[PDB]
Amino acid sequence: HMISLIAALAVDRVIGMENAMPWNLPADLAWFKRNTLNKPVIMGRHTWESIGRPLPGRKNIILSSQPGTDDRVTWVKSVDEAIAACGDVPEIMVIGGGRVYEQFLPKAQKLYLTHIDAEVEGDTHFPDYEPDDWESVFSEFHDADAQNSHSYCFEILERR
Ligand SMILES: NC(=O)c1ccc[n+]([C@@H]2O[C@H](COP(=O)([O-])OP(=O)(O)OC[C@H]3O[C@@H](n4cnc5c(N)ncnc54)[C@H](OP(=O)(O)O)[C@@H]3O)[C@@H](O)[C@H]2O)c1
Ligand SMILES: Nc1nc(=O)c2nc(CNc3ccc(C(=O)N[C@@H](CCC(=O)O)C(=O)O)cc3)cnc2[nH]1
Protein backbone atom coordinates (compact mmCIF):
# COMPACT_ATOMS: atom_id res chain seq x y z
CA HIS A 1 0.00 0.00 0.00
CA MET A 2 2.28 2.81 1.32
CA ILE A 3 5.48 2.93 3.39
CA SER A 4 6.40 6.10 5.29
CA LEU A 5 9.50 7.02 7.28
CA ILE A 6 9.24 9.18 10.41
CA ALA A 7 12.34 10.64 12.03
CA ALA A 8 13.68 13.60 13.99
CA LEU A 9 16.93 15.08 12.65
CA ALA A 10 19.31 17.50 14.31
CA VAL A 11 21.96 19.43 12.38
CA ASP A 12 23.79 17.28 9.79
CA ARG A 13 20.91 14.74 9.82
CA VAL A 14 22.09 13.39 13.20
CA ILE A 15 19.46 11.10 14.71
CA GLY A 16 21.32 9.19 17.44
CA MET A 17 24.27 8.92 19.81
CA GLU A 18 25.36 5.89 21.86
CA ASN A 19 21.98 4.33 21.06
CA ALA A 20 20.16 7.28 22.64
CA MET A 21 18.20 10.28 21.47
CA PRO A 22 20.55 13.28 21.74
CA TRP A 23 17.88 15.85 22.64
CA ASN A 24 14.68 16.19 24.65
CA LEU A 25 11.78 17.55 22.58
CA PRO A 26 8.38 16.54 23.98
CA ALA A 27 6.43 18.40 21.28
CA ASP A 28 8.19 16.25 18.69
CA LEU A 29 7.64 13.01 20.61
CA ALA A 30 3.96 14.03 20.71
CA TRP A 31 4.05 14.51 16.92
CA PHE A 32 5.63 11.06 16.59
CA LYS A 33 2.83 9.47 18.61
CA ARG A 34 0.12 11.32 16.66
CA ASN A 35 1.54 10.11 13.35
CA THR A 36 2.21 6.50 14.39
CA LEU A 37 -0.69 5.63 16.72
CA ASN A 38 -2.87 2.79 15.38
CA LYS A 39 -0.37 1.98 12.61
CA PRO A 40 2.30 -0.70 12.41
CA VAL A 41 5.78 0.56 13.23
CA ILE A 42 8.89 -1.11 11.84
CA MET A 43 12.18 -0.63 13.65
CA GLY A 44 15.66 -2.09 13.89
CA ARG A 45 16.78 -3.98 16.97
CA HIS A 46 18.97 -1.10 18.20
CA THR A 47 16.01 1.26 18.08
CA TRP A 48 13.82 -1.31 19.86
CA GLU A 49 16.47 -1.32 22.60
CA SER A 50 16.62 2.50 22.72
CA ILE A 51 12.84 2.85 23.05
CA GLY A 52 12.98 0.17 25.74
CA ARG A 53 9.39 -1.16 25.59
CA PRO A 54 6.56 -1.77 23.08
CA LEU A 55 4.96 1.39 21.75
CA PRO A 56 1.33 1.10 22.92
CA GLY A 57 -1.46 1.16 20.38
CA ARG A 58 0.90 0.14 17.58
CA LYS A 59 1.92 -3.15 16.03
CA ASN A 60 5.65 -3.25 16.86
CA ILE A 61 7.77 -5.06 14.25
CA ILE A 62 11.51 -5.53 15.02
CA LEU A 63 14.09 -6.33 12.35
CA SER A 64 16.83 -8.62 13.64
CA SER A 65 18.89 -11.39 12.06
CA GLN A 66 18.75 -13.29 15.36
CA PRO A 67 15.81 -14.87 17.25
CA GLY A 68 13.34 -12.63 19.01
CA THR A 69 13.74 -11.98 22.74
CA ASP A 70 10.29 -10.56 23.59
CA ASP A 71 6.88 -11.95 22.63
CA ARG A 72 5.11 -8.62 23.13
CA VAL A 73 6.42 -7.58 19.68
CA THR A 74 6.80 -9.20 16.25
CA TRP A 75 10.31 -10.23 15.17
CA VAL A 76 11.25 -10.46 11.49
CA LYS A 77 14.46 -11.29 9.65
CA SER A 78 14.23 -9.25 6.42
CA VAL A 79 12.77 -6.05 5.01
CA ASP A 80 10.22 -7.99 2.96
CA GLU A 81 9.07 -10.01 5.99
CA ALA A 82 8.76 -6.81 8.06
CA ILE A 83 6.45 -5.32 5.42
CA ALA A 84 4.44 -8.55 5.22
CA ALA A 85 4.04 -8.80 8.99
CA CYS A 86 2.33 -5.39 8.94
CA GLY A 87 -0.71 -6.88 7.20
CA ASP A 88 -3.03 -4.92 4.90
CA VAL A 89 -2.96 -1.42 6.40
CA PRO A 90 -3.20 2.02 4.76
CA GLU A 91 0.23 3.13 6.00
CA ILE A 92 3.34 1.44 7.40
CA MET A 93 5.49 3.67 9.61
CA VAL A 94 9.24 2.99 9.58
CA ILE A 95 10.69 4.48 12.74
CA GLY A 96 14.43 3.83 12.32
CA GLY A 97 17.13 3.72 13.06
CA GLY A 98 19.82 4.66 10.54
CA ARG A 99 20.35 1.25 8.96
CA VAL A 100 16.61 0.56 8.72
CA TYR A 101 15.83 4.03 7.35
CA GLU A 102 18.46 3.44 4.63
CA GLN A 103 16.74 0.22 3.54
CA PHE A 104 13.19 1.58 3.56
CA LEU A 105 13.79 5.02 2.00
CA PRO A 106 13.78 3.66 -1.61
CA LYS A 107 10.43 2.02 -0.80
CA ALA A 108 8.85 5.04 0.89
CA GLN A 109 6.21 7.33 -0.54
CA LYS A 110 6.19 9.73 2.41
CA LEU A 111 8.67 11.18 4.90
CA TYR A 112 7.62 12.72 8.23
CA LEU A 113 10.67 14.74 9.25
CA THR A 114 11.26 16.98 12.22
CA HIS A 115 14.19 19.34 11.73
CA ILE A 116 15.60 20.22 15.15
CA ASP A 117 17.79 23.32 15.55
CA ALA A 118 20.33 21.52 17.73
CA GLU A 119 24.05 20.89 17.23
CA VAL A 120 24.66 17.37 18.49
CA GLU A 121 27.39 14.74 18.49
CA GLY A 122 26.08 11.80 16.54
CA ASP A 123 27.05 8.31 15.45
CA THR A 124 23.81 7.69 13.51
CA HIS A 125 22.32 9.70 10.64
CA PHE A 126 19.12 9.83 8.64
CA PRO A 127 19.85 8.68 5.06
CA ASP A 128 21.02 11.22 2.49
CA TYR A 129 17.84 11.51 0.42
CA GLU A 130 17.82 13.15 -3.03
CA PRO A 131 15.80 16.37 -2.61
CA ASP A 132 14.63 16.37 -6.25
CA ASP A 133 12.57 13.24 -5.56
CA TRP A 134 10.49 14.83 -2.77
CA GLU A 135 7.83 17.53 -2.55
CA SER A 136 7.08 19.32 0.70
CA VAL A 137 3.36 19.07 1.40
CA PHE A 138 3.41 20.33 5.00
CA SER A 139 5.72 22.54 7.05
CA GLU A 140 5.22 23.91 10.56
CA PHE A 141 7.98 25.77 12.42
CA HIS A 142 8.01 26.19 16.20
CA ASP A 143 10.23 28.32 18.41
CA ALA A 144 11.78 26.88 21.56
CA ASP A 145 9.72 27.27 24.75
CA ALA A 146 9.68 26.25 28.42
CA GLN A 147 9.04 22.60 27.47
CA ASN A 148 11.12 22.37 24.26
CA SER A 149 14.69 23.61 24.46
CA HIS A 150 15.23 23.85 20.68
CA SER A 151 13.28 25.33 17.83
CA TYR A 152 12.03 22.70 15.42
CA CYS A 153 10.09 22.33 12.21
CA PHE A 154 7.62 19.58 11.34
CA GLU A 155 7.68 18.59 7.68
CA ILE A 156 5.95 15.99 5.54
CA LEU A 157 7.45 15.15 2.15
CA GLU A 158 5.75 13.10 -0.56
CA ARG A 159 7.72 11.29 -3.25
CA ARG A 160 7.31 13.11 -6.57
N1 LIG B 1 15.81 10.57 16.02
C2 LIG B 1 15.19 9.57 15.30
O3 LIG B 1 14.35 9.89 14.45
C4 LIG B 1 15.57 8.18 15.53
C5 LIG B 1 14.73 7.08 15.00
C6 LIG B 1 15.19 5.74 15.44
C7 LIG B 1 16.34 5.58 16.11
N8 LIG B 1 17.18 6.66 16.42
C9 LIG B 1 18.54 6.42 16.93
O10 LIG B 1 19.20 5.63 15.99
C11 LIG B 1 20.16 4.78 16.67
C12 LIG B 1 20.00 3.30 16.24
O13 LIG B 1 19.96 3.30 14.85
P14 LIG B 1 21.01 2.08 14.23
O15 LIG B 1 21.23 2.47 12.82
O16 LIG B 1 22.19 2.12 15.18
O17 LIG B 1 20.39 0.60 14.40
P18 LIG B 1 18.83 0.23 13.89
O19 LIG B 1 18.75 0.51 12.43
O20 LIG B 1 17.79 0.72 14.85
O21 LIG B 1 18.82 -1.38 14.14
C22 LIG B 1 19.90 -1.97 13.42
C23 LIG B 1 19.73 -3.48 13.69
O24 LIG B 1 18.43 -3.90 13.20
C25 LIG B 1 18.59 -5.18 12.60
N26 LIG B 1 18.36 -5.09 11.15
C27 LIG B 1 18.32 -3.95 10.32
N28 LIG B 1 18.05 -4.25 9.03
C29 LIG B 1 17.92 -5.66 9.03
C30 LIG B 1 17.65 -6.59 8.01
N31 LIG B 1 17.46 -6.18 6.71
N32 LIG B 1 17.56 -7.91 8.28
C33 LIG B 1 17.77 -8.26 9.60
N34 LIG B 1 18.03 -7.52 10.67
C35 LIG B 1 18.10 -6.18 10.36
C36 LIG B 1 20.01 -5.72 13.00
O37 LIG B 1 19.82 -6.26 14.21
P38 LIG B 1 20.82 -7.73 14.52
O39 LIG B 1 22.13 -7.03 14.74
O40 LIG B 1 20.08 -8.20 15.74
O41 LIG B 1 20.65 -8.53 13.23
C42 LIG B 1 20.80 -4.39 13.03
O43 LIG B 1 21.86 -4.55 13.89
C44 LIG B 1 19.91 4.97 18.21
O45 LIG B 1 20.83 5.95 18.66
C46 LIG B 1 18.51 5.56 18.24
O47 LIG B 1 18.36 6.43 19.34
C48 LIG B 1 16.74 7.95 16.20
N1 LIG C 1 9.78 12.72 14.82
C2 LIG C 1 10.37 11.70 15.50
N3 LIG C 1 10.88 11.96 16.74
C4 LIG C 1 11.48 11.03 17.49
O5 LIG C 1 11.95 11.29 18.62
C6 LIG C 1 11.56 9.67 16.93
N7 LIG C 1 12.13 8.65 17.61
C8 LIG C 1 12.18 7.43 17.05
C9 LIG C 1 12.81 6.30 17.81
N10 LIG C 1 12.82 6.59 19.25
C11 LIG C 1 11.73 6.74 20.04
C12 LIG C 1 11.95 6.99 21.39
C13 LIG C 1 10.87 7.14 22.25
C14 LIG C 1 9.57 7.07 21.78
C15 LIG C 1 8.44 7.26 22.74
O16 LIG C 1 8.64 7.10 23.93
N17 LIG C 1 7.24 7.58 22.27
C18 LIG C 1 6.06 7.34 23.08
C19 LIG C 1 5.77 8.54 24.00
C20 LIG C 1 5.23 9.73 23.22
C21 LIG C 1 5.47 11.03 23.96
O22 LIG C 1 6.35 11.07 24.84
O23 LIG C 1 4.78 12.03 23.65
C24 LIG C 1 4.87 7.04 22.21
O25 LIG C 1 3.84 6.60 22.75
O26 LIG C 1 4.96 7.24 20.98
C27 LIG C 1 9.34 6.83 20.43
C28 LIG C 1 10.42 6.67 19.56
C29 LIG C 1 11.65 7.23 15.78
N30 LIG C 1 11.07 8.21 15.07
C31 LIG C 1 11.00 9.45 15.59
N32 LIG C 1 10.43 10.48 14.94
CA distance 43 to 45: 7
For the CA of 56, the nearest ligand = 2
- Per the entry, the structure determination technique was X-ray
Residues 93, 80 contacting (CB under 8 angstroms):
no
**146 backbone φψ class: left, alpha, beta (φ>0; ψ -120 to 50):** alpha
Q: Taking the domains of the chain in order of start, what are their residue ranges?
A: 1-160
Nearest CA to ligand 2 atom 16: 51
Amino acid at 152: Y
* Resolution for the entry shown, Å: 1.8
Residues with Cβ within 6 A of ligand 2?
A: 6-8, 21, 26, 28-33, 47, 50-51, 55, 95-96, 114
Specify the fold of 1-160.
Answer: Dihydrofolate Reductase, subunit A (3.40.430)
Atom of ligand 1 nearest to the CA of 19: 45
Percent of the chain that is helix, strand, coil (3-state, to 5)? 25, 35, 40
What DSSP string runs through 99-145?
A: HHHHHHGGG-SEEEEEEE------SEE-----GGGEEEEEEEEE---
Give CA 100 to chain center in angstroms: 9
Contacts with 65 (C-beta within 8 Å, 6 or more apart), sequence order: 77
